Amino acid sequence: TRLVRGVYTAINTGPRQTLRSLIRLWAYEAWRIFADRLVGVKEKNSFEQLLYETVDKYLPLGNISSTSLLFSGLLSLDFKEVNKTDLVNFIEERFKTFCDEELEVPMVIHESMVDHILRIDRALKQVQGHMMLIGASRTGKTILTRFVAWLNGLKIVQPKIHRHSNLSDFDMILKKAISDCSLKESRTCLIIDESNI
Amino acid sequence: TICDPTNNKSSAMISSPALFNRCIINWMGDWDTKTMSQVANNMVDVVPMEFTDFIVPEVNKELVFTEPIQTIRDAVVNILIHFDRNFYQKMKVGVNPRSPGYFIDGLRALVKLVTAKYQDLQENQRFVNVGLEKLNESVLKVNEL
Amino acid sequence: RSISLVKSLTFEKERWLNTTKQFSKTSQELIGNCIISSIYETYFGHLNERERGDMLVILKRLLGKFAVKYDVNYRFIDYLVTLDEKMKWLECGLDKNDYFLENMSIVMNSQDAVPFLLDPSSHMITVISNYYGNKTVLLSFLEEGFVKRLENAVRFGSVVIIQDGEFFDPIISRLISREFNHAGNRVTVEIGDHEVDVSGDFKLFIHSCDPSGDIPIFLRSRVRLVHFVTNKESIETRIFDITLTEENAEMQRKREDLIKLNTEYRLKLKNLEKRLLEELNNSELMVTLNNLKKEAMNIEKKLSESEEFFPQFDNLVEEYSIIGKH
Amino acid sequence: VLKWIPRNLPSCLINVESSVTSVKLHPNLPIVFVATDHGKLYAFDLFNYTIPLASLQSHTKAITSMDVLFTNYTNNYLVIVTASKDLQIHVFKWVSEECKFQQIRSLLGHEHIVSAVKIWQKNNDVHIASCSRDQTVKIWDFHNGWSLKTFQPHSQWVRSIDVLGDYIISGSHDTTLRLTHWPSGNGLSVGTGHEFPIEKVKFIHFIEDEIRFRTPSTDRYKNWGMQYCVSASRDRTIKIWEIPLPTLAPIPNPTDSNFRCVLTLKGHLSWVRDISIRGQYLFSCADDKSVRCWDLNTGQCLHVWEKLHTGFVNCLDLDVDFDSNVTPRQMMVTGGLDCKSNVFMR
Amino acid sequence: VLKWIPRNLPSCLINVESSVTSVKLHPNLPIVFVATDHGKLYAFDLFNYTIPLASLQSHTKAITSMDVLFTNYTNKKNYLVIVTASKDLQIHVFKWVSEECKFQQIRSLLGHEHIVSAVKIWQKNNDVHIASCSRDQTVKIWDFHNGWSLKTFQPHSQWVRSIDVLGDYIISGSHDTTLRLTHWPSGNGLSVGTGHEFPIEKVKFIHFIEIRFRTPSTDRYKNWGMQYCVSASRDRTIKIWEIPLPTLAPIPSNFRCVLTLKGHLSWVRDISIRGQYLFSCADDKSVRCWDLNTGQCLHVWEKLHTGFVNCLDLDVDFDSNVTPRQMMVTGGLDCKSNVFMR
Ligand SMILES: Nc1ncnc2c1ncn2[C@@H]1O[C@H](COP(=O)(O)OP(=O)(O)O)[C@@H](O)[C@H]1O
Known part of the structure; x- marks a missing residue:
């Protein structure tokens, strides 16, 4: 069902499409629905060859790998396929502006982090969409979430949970965020870390 | 945001019914070798690195992680990524994800220290050469008189 | 006079010629030495001596595999610990052992990442307090008013050491992550709910006296953890020092004064050579350079006079070696 | 004399040390x-x-x-x-x-x-x-x-201000416009309708020549000397606003303290950085490495200067035509993030 | 535009620590x-x-x-x-x-x-x-x-002492009084030529500009694209040479001198070509402008530096990506450099 809804969003917010474009779009949606929970590189290769076999056998097309499929609506008014170097340059300039405006941190733009930004943007674009970033420390999870939230106009709220803090503080900050979300019509993006539980 | 998905709290977050059924799980994982090679190249290509001769070695295709070795930069990014992988292998971390923060910190320390050392070495050699030249000029002037 | 001045610089000319001969070697192998230095500075902080040596030999093999060269006689102290810094550290109160020198060098050379002093002996708090004089402040995670006092320390900008670091309080996460909001010529940091102003000379230190303690992964990944344990050489030289100062106190004091004078003379000779090279670079001068090498000859004569006391100490070391090893 | 449209290619290239x-x-x-x-x-x-x-x-x-x-x-x-x-x-x-x-x-x-x-x-x-x-x-x-x-x-x-006589407006990061009277130092009305910060806002000066959006509607607006203000935000849009007439030191009107977006231009692909006014034409640059030219009467793009720069087009400028002391030449200059500046002549 | 002449007085005087x-x-x-x-x-x-x-x-x-x-x-x-x-x-x-x-x-x-x-x-x-x-x-x-x-x-x-490169053809001048045109990948000497008695200082191509000394003579020269050359040595002279056409991978045959210019009083150091004009410095602190068409000196600049003069520089006029700016720059041995603008 999530795959169907993602295909609907991509079709509705997209330009005129061809059959190869439908295949690429459906494969990207399958990648973002089924293959994100995968952990192993062997499992990723198995999923890639499975997608090869499925498309070849049921739909009688370029490379379909994860880094070769970048669907985004950042570069235009529609959710279309984008190139690589132009997207990297645009996100470089946007990150330089973000470092100028909010906080300075020296991170280097590369392929996998661009793909992760695109999928985080896709997840946060959905209505009632929530994420569970799972990865090693200092990989760039919360700062990427902050950058994508700034790109989409989301307000950033981080709970100030620390030592000698109880459930009353958590309820207070949650109620404040809820009131800001509803009464003040301010789009907020709460970020809960593992250390904040 | 989950750092170690093996601990009890993170296992409770993952195995909770509605959190799993509502959130789009995006497994970042540890960085793979291509990502670390790319970021290492992109943050060491701005330093004076290749200033001596270099002979390309003979290594296996799967043993090298970057493009085939041409300059000092490919060699140093390969040696850094391979040593980081070996160091994580020696610490017996298991299936626990490996933080690449040590790699980034070491690479920043490397670029800063190589810049400082290259500047100091060039200044010292210029000083010793101008001193030797001044001594030779003084010797020539003394021999002329 | 000119002939005498030229003839008076024969040893320095030989040293300059040897340095120019060795420049090709020391430039061909610079990248490897820098690689090993960076690996020491970023990885081997939280390791023991045997594990450090094991990853040293595998890193030497791996570095030689990719046809990049290094120094065969490379040592971390000889590469990073400058002699003036060594003198300052020894005068502050840190021991003469080399492992502690390596760890003090890795601590006082990380200006980008805050260090984690894992010191069970609880004396590096006072040696770091001695390094910065009376301007330092001692904080802890178990004191009321810690937030306000840390904010005042940030506004003042003094060197701050936080003890009991295994009970980490996550309100300083913006200071651990070193993310700064640059507001013109002032730098602000949001701590808690109200921001503060960084004085620019603010330095943070976290010290924990609990081996095998518990620290958050967020704290662990961004803080250079360094261990501090007593190895065989430290206890051996400490036992030797105790037994020598309990056997012959005046003789021990004379030996300590002798070695301090020797290393001070070596530092003065190095500074003297640097000053002479700098003075000759920018070119009265002849009489000045005469005074320079007269001071050099006096220092050499003083060292040669000081040479005639060391075999006695070697004999005492050979005598007390059994006590040290037991 | 006023409806000059720049050609498809820049007249000359100017090289600058860094981003313009x-x-x-x-x-x-x-x-x-x-x-x-x-x-x-x-x-x-x-x-x-x-x-x-x-x-x-x-x-x-x-x-x-x-x-x-x-x-x-x-x-x-x-x-x-x-x-x-x-x-x-x-x-x-x-x-x-x-x-x-x-x-x-x-x-x-x-x-x-x-x-x-x-x-x-x-x-x-x-x-x-x-x-x-x-x-x-x-x-x-x-x-x-x-x-x-x-x-x-x-x-x-x-982030940006504009003046006209004694009145100054100011777009801001909180996506709200505000008209403040300079001699009295108090606000008059606010604007709402954007969800991205305002990049550039400027007034619409009246001209005596026919253009729909540069002429007064009532005698009160003619006496005030200003009726329309245009704001460019990061919403990839251009909005023409309506300033309510204050009750006149001017007194704010609580029943008319809000703006009104009469027109909402759209068609860009990224943030609109800088905007300009010339005749019946709306000249705007954006981060799409392109400059558009909207018509105030119809709200339709009449020319697309695609790939003017290799990077972001940070700025452009025209000459003021409402002021009698400045001759409105047919010269428009633009500047980009690619360390280049394009000057259009004739 | 391309016929600019530098003014008698320099527009910028720059100081450095040692000789330029x-x-x-x-x-x-x-x-x-x-x-x-x-x-x-x-x-x-x-x-x-x-x-x-x-x-x-x-x-x-x-x-x-x-x-x-x-x-x-x-x-x-x-x-x-x-x-x-x-x-x-x-x-x-x-x-x-x-x-x-x-x-x-x-x-x-x-x-x-x-x-x-x-x-x-x-x-x-x-x-x-x-x-x-x-x-x-x-x-x-x-x-x-x-x-x-x-x-x-x-x-x-x-x-x-000096190499110039165009396409896949290399012109080199040595301490010996001869020059040589060789091919780039094959590394074979296509043509040689003598005519001096003192070491060459700077030698460079003469390119084609869309004129007596910038125009191809025959269609057999237009397709090749190389016709002329300029050289200068310690002989106080500047020689314009013609190139022999190799038999085409080229197969090699001697240099032809078609023009000579004289008037320097010491060793020349640099040769630079802008349109129709030639700028050259000589160790008598003399910067001279020569006309390629007429074949005589036009303007002089003396005592620009107290010491010797080392080099000049002007923008390349025969390349599309390089704008031929109306400016010139030169250096001397007396810690001095001169910039002529407009
Ligand atoms: N692509 C990258 N290049 C360089 N450094 C990075 C990159 N991604 C993350 N980092 C480092 O990680 C830090 C941010 O990680 P963060 O998302 O805060 O980790 P966590 O999600 O565990 O809180 C930054 O200080 C940065 O130095």
Whole structure:
């Protein structure tokens, strides 16, 4: 069902499409629905060859790998396929502006982090969409979430949970965020870390 | 945001019914070798690195992680990524994800220290050469008189 | 006079010629030495001596595999610990052992990442307090008013050491992550709910006296953890020092004064050579350079006079070696 | 005479040391002043652009905005006022005898970076406006050198301002416009409808010639001298607003304290950075490496200057046509992030 | 436009720490690069000439020559590449970061057994290479991307002092009074020619401009594209030579001298061509402008430097990517450099 809804969003917010474009779009949606929970590189290769076999056998097309499929609506008014170097340059300039405006941190733009930004943007674009970033420390999870939230106009709220803090503080900050979300019509993006539980 | 998905709290977050059924799980994982090679190249290509001769070695295709070795930069990014992988292998971390923060910190320390050392070495050699030249000029002037 | 001045610089000319001969070697192998230095500075902080040596030999093999060269006689102290810094550290109160020198060098050379002093002996708090004089402040995670006092320390900008670091309080996460909001010529940091102003000379230190303690992964990944344990050489030289100062106190004091004078003379000779090279670079001068090498000859004569006391100490070391090893 | 449309290709290429932040045109001499993100302030010739006339480094930070003014009096030069992230507003003198630059005075007081600086002359008393991240719209005096007034009209920081007579508006980061009366220092009305910060906002001066959006509707708006204001945000859109008529020191009207978006232009692909007004045409640049040209009557794009630069198009500038002291030449200059500036001639 | 003559008085006077050996000009910016005898590079703003924008210790010995080129890639970003050659048996290649006005060392080329005297940079369709002459009597051709060697040959018994490059053809002049035109990949001597009795200082091609000395004569010369050459030696003369057409992989036959110019009083050092005019300096502190068409000296500049004069520089006029600015720059031995603008 999530795959169907993602295909609907991509079709509705997209330009005129061809059959190869439908295949690429459906494969990207399958990648973002089924293959994100995968952990192993062997499992990723198995999923890639499975997608090869499925498309070849049921739909009688370029490379379909994860880094070769970048669907985004950042570069235009529609959710279309984008190139690589132009997207990297645009996100470089946007990150330089973000470092100028909010906080300075020296991170280097590369392929996998661009793909992760695109999928985080896709997840946060959905209505009632929530994420569970799972990865090693200092990989760039919360700062990427902050950058994508700034790109989409989301307000950033981080709970100030620390030592000698109880459930009353958590309820207070949650109620404040809820009131800001509803009464003040301010789009907020709460970020809960593992250390904040 | 989950750092170690093996601990009890993170296992409770993952195995909770509605959190799993509502959130789009995006497994970042540890960085793979291509990502670390790319970021290492992109943050060491701005330093004076290749200033001596270099002979390309003979290594296996799967043993090298970057493009085939041409300059000092490919060699140093390969040696850094391979040593980081070996160091994580020696610490017996298991299936626990490996933080690449040590790699980034070491690479920043490397670029800063190589810049400082290259500047100091060039200044010292210029000083010793101008001193030797001044001594030779003084010797020539003394021999002329 | 000119002939005498030229003839008076024969040893320095030989040293300059040897340095120019060795420049090709020391430039061909610079990248490897820098690689090993960076690996020491970023990885081997939280390791023991045997594990450090094991990853040293595998890193030497791996570095030689990719046809990049290094120094065969490379040592971390000889590469990073400058002699003036060594003198300052020894005068502050840190021991003469080399492992502690390596760890003090890795601590006082990380200006980008805050260090984690894992010191069970609880004396590096006072040696770091001695390094910065009376301007330092001692904080802890178990004191009321810690937030306000840390904010005042940030506004003042003094060197701050936080003890009991295994009970980490996550309100300083913006200071651990070193993310700064640059507001013109002032730098602000949001701590808690109200921001503060960084004085620019603010330095943070976290010290924990609990081996095998518990620290958050967020704290662990961004803080250079360094261990501090007593190895065989430290206890051996400490036992030797105790037994020598309990056997012959005046003789021990004379030996300590002798070695301090020797290393001070070596530092003065190095500074003297640097000053002479700098003075000759920018070119009265002849009489000045005469005074320079007269001071050099006096220092050499003083060292040669000081040479005639060391075999006695070697004999005492050979005598007390059994006590040290037991 | 007024409906001139620039060609499909730029007339000439100007190379700058770093990213171009602002460009302005001398109202009399055909020369162009180009800002520089490195901090320099160039001054090029529209006919001999191979070598610059003069350029000096006056800031340690990036120059943010600038504008020119050919001074006139009731009793006679050109003045350039420069913004910078260095917390200073450096005012310069352009001497035409030796075609050089001479720094005059610096205006201090802001506690952070400034964003836009505007200058205007009225009854031989020229004033310099300013706006910073302190969300304080401080207005100085050029002749005296000291401050005149200071007020905070927004919760978050302002980004651009515009003046017309005694009224000043200011777009801000919190996506709200606000009209504040300068002599009285109080707000009149607010604007709402954006969910991205305002990049550039400017007034719509009336013209006597027919254009739908540059003519008064009622006699009250003709007496006020202003009816329309245009704001460009990061919503990839252009909005023409309606300012409600205040009850007149002017008194705010609680029943009419809100704006009204009469028209909402759309068609860009990224943030609109800078906007301009010329005749019945709306000239706007954006981060799509392109410049559009909207029509005020219909709201349709009539030309697409695709791939004008290889990067973001940070700024463009025209000549003011409402003012009788400035001849509205058919010259439009643009500046980009790709260290290039394109000048359009004829 | 292309017929500009520098004024009698210089427009900018720049001071440095030691003698100036190589002066180059930014093809796109009003920035001048100068090299000193201490192996130091100074990057100077034109309108702010007192304080150096950039100052770097490039080499431990004296720099001899320097060349610049703006890269052009059709894919990737462009940047300015500067090359420095010195007496350290090394060649250094830097990228000029114009974002913050600071040099950045890209790489180095090693392999020459003695000092290197001249290094050139030219761009192919999508690749860049570099040539070098040394005391080893060896012309060596390296590439900027990989860094390892592509060509090496010994064309002359004496040591080559100046190389010029166009396309796949190399003209080199040595301490011996002869020149040589060779082919780039094959490394064979297509043509030689003598006519001097003193060592050559600078030799370079004469390109085609869309004129007596810029026009192809026959259709058999237009397709090849190379017709003329210019050379200068310590003979106080500047010689315009004609090239023999090789039998086309080329197969090699002697040089023809079609013009000579005289009037210098000491050793000349540099040759530069702008449109119809020729700019040359000679060690009597004399900067002379000669006309190629008429064939005589037009204007002189004397006592520009108290000491000797080392080099000039003007922008390339025969390249599309380089704007022929109305400006000129020169250096001297007395820690002085002159900039003529407009
Ligand atoms: N692509 C990258 N290049 C360089 N550094 C990075 C990159 N991604 C993350 N980092 C480092 O990680 C830090 C941010 O990680 P963060 O998202 O805060 O980790 P966590 O999610 O565990 O809180 C930064 O200080 C940065 O130095």
